[model samples]
Target: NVPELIGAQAHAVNVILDAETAYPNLIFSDDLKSVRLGNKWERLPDGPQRFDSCIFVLGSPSFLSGRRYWEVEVGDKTAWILGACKTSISRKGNMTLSPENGYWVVIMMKENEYQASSVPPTRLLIKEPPKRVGIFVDYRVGSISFYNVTARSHIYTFASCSFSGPLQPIFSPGTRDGGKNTAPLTICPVG
Candidate 1:
């Protein structure tokens, strides 16, 4: 629950999710600003860009190097994952999310189960669940940070990362867990 107001929101960028990179079980709104989980697998095209077992999607406007900010409204969603990933990471299923695996992100499992993907995963004790989570990636500086937007505080930050190549924003509106997590993860307009 340690939040610092570093004005990270100033770097806000438009995060339009790319359906081509998504797993079949995920559906995106026509505007590409929001995404939710589907109960059954969809008959999506197979390719090197699509993700299979990961249940994830990547956002467009990839970054080569620089600081960028974006926000996702988790709202009442019980589970979801958001952050950044390398453009060259294998689209095939590896079943793990980590910086070593080319993923620098944070996850929310159920209501209060906030966790940062740090090694075995660091359990974050967030008393006030963030309805809208903010992702700030300083690529050149090698740091990825997550913030509780509504709470105006910091959630977690991965610093001193060895980020390479191009990077894409990632969103995993976790599976619909018995219908408890039906809420969509929407990218705010930064308006």
Candidate 2:
């Protein structure tokens, strides 16, 4: 319903990956400009905040209000997850990426399969996957949308989203599928 707003609402924002908040199995490089799932397991200390799977990381400057937009360089990653999540999302063990779990995301499970993380997950029909993805969030407006930056085409939108607290941009290169999905998800800098 808000798709028309993309033309007028699109803008760049400065966002960086938060290394300390990243899942132990993910790596943050280039001053947190990039994030990728580690090929090897890291024996990290047991903690309630550690993620066991679906490796992910949070972005800096978590937003609690107002409009925000940022872009990510997805590169050639065959599998990835992108969107916004509630600040208190569970980091321990395997977690379902559902709105009920406070994660509103779109996942690229394969080169041709895209899905919005929601109950009865919606399948997205994208003709061309994007190399760069644009994320727009209007906290007060209760909406979040994704765009195929390269084509300037809309991807998916999560509407009427309720925010209990701050929400942070979330990223995941997805779980390693052999060596087929190791490309890093980079945070593209805004000029």
Candidate 3:
């Protein structure tokens, strides 16, 4: 069920997935607004930006020094990761979601297991799962906050950070019951 847009609509922007960095298993719509969790394609060199054996993708917009707000629709999906990642984030095979690795993300892996990718990896106890999540980023001030639009409450925020490069929206959609969550994650227009 769709709900009213949160008031943070002021700082929102267009967030389309950057398919150039898409992994083999990631599928993106021509419009770039819709992206599926998994897929396949050419075996050409994946270039430095492109990746393999990973489950994530980055967005087109890069925020250097400003407060930006964006909304994402996860709904009743299963496995997904959403956050703003520093441009220089590690892409090695032994990667983990943490600020040290230049990733600022919150993940919902298996059934309601929500956690933020803070320095120490904080566990989030969200009683009511968020159908629509809001990501508010403060670049120069170093603050990234997540809000539950459906519950109309604050979820969590990552503060006091030193980022080297511009931040980009990072996303990863996965599945449990054979690659079938509820639906694809959509970057919603802030109303």
Candidate 4:
């Protein structure tokens, strides 16, 4: 069910998914290459698997305006946006992902406050490419998963997907949701 390969078919299928195969413990990676996330994200020795020239810094209202760094850049191949969209900063630059390049999830609000989401078809960005995985599961505040960065596996559902509240610091420009699916409070997709 995973098939979303791009850019030389994702480096001829690298397949670097490991964290003892973690999913639902949550996940985060933007390809790390500011000399390996300036040295974090678990001591990058091919850290959290593999990523090349990546950036993902999401921190809005982190205990009230003390930390904020929102980024997502998978360069040379495509996928852009360098800063300011944790909910907009007068619309900075690099924010156009409809087709010119794939892999996406960039939900921003508070500017106009827009909400209405949905992306759960086995949840994992339509699975199959070089892999871009991220997940969050709330089976009553429990499981959160992330895995196999960007190749594709189809799960991107946000059924009752409503945003723009008192919540910010979200740039889900490549879908994956598993938060709550017990008898109704639902948004499930895993494979």
Candidate 5:
């Protein structure tokens, strides 16, 4: 079922990261190819549009209608998060990653442990955690699915959702955690 929905729109195009919409704590590469959590604050302007601990970033080109897909290169990181979210979702302070809050995400808490941020939250058992992940979103179907690009297997999906406004791809390489999860989450070029 998931495989049939993946290529409905040829899901093979590079998605750019929007540095202007990125959380200040998140460091976006000059080329906008990857993003990582900054170890320290760079004295960014304080405002309600910034995130304090979520360490999140948004991608360019918001999706309003149709099927869209993109992939990310998640190296050997112990923690990270990725998904699509409403353009109006919270950006300041501690925000919960839940559908009610307009966030649909899959989170990697630690090595080999992953979870989807549904209303009740579901645990995902992936034998070999993927080094690269593919995200597919079908706005008309109201569904978003994640894939293990290396293994060519389905990882997780959020179904029966509603989209009233535009949605942007969201990501978090996770906190520095004393330099434990330092690897950047790169937006892989799809072709």
Candidate 6:
């Protein structure tokens, strides 16, 4: 398993069942996992009906699931961890990953489990205007595909990207060319 660090309190988003709650949070097994899907808290502390699902945290809280040892430290605003066996997908359709923002990353840990969906194995998404972020598919036999969300229908594929066996933690930081200083324009001068 990989342990990736997301920039502390650096503005992030987490899609959850309760939009009002925070992230790096957890739900008791009784609250998640339901046979009928559609905004129902199924996927509890235990395994779900589907494949390995996802989990998330909005920022940082701490002491989630007393036995898991998964606690969010103060100042550690974290969210969004997929349940070990769950997924969201569509058929031959368009999907957007990541929201449009300045700097962001997708840290796919080692031994990550993807749900069994006909819509492809990859789940998490990031969609930012005029920006392309790094996506590392950490699965032995699955693909993390990308599509254009600009068109009215049939989101076109920008690239066919995938990662397989032996691929360790994937970093999702935005990169720049060596010839240019690509840092964002800062209003406050450095000391």
Model 5 lDDT tens row, 13-73? 5678887667776777788989887757554455666665667888877879988888889
Query: Candidate 2, 142: how far from true, in Å?
Result: 0.2
Off by over 4 Å in 4: 1-36, 40-56, 59-129, 132-153, 166-191
lDDT of 1 at 167: 88
Location of the lowest summed lDDT over 10 successive residues in candidate 5: 1-10
Point out where model 5 deviates above 4 Å.
Answer: 4-9, 41-48
In model 1, which regions exceed 4 Å deviation? 1-6, 41-43
Candidate 1 contains a number of clashing pairs equal to 2
For candidate 4, the 10 contiguous residues with the lowest summed lDDT are: 179-188
Model 3 TM-score (2 dp): 0.87
Candidate 1 residue pairs in backbone clash: 3-153, 3-154
Taking the tens digit of each residue's C-alpha lDDT, what string does model 4 give over 32-133? 112112213333333342222223333233111211112222222122121112233212224342211211242322222222222221222322322233
- Report, for every candidate in turn, its global Cα lDDT versus the true structure: 0.84, 0.80, 0.77, 0.24, 0.81, 0.21
Compute the lDDT for candidate 1. Answer: 0.84
Q: What TM-score should be assigned to candidate 1? A: 0.92
Per candidate, the number of residue pairs that clash is 2, 0, 1, 46, 0, 42
Model 3: runs farther than 4 Å from truth?
1-7, 39-48
lDDT, model 3 = 0.77
Give RMSD to native, each candidate: 2.2, 2.3, 4.0, 17.9, 2.0, 19.0
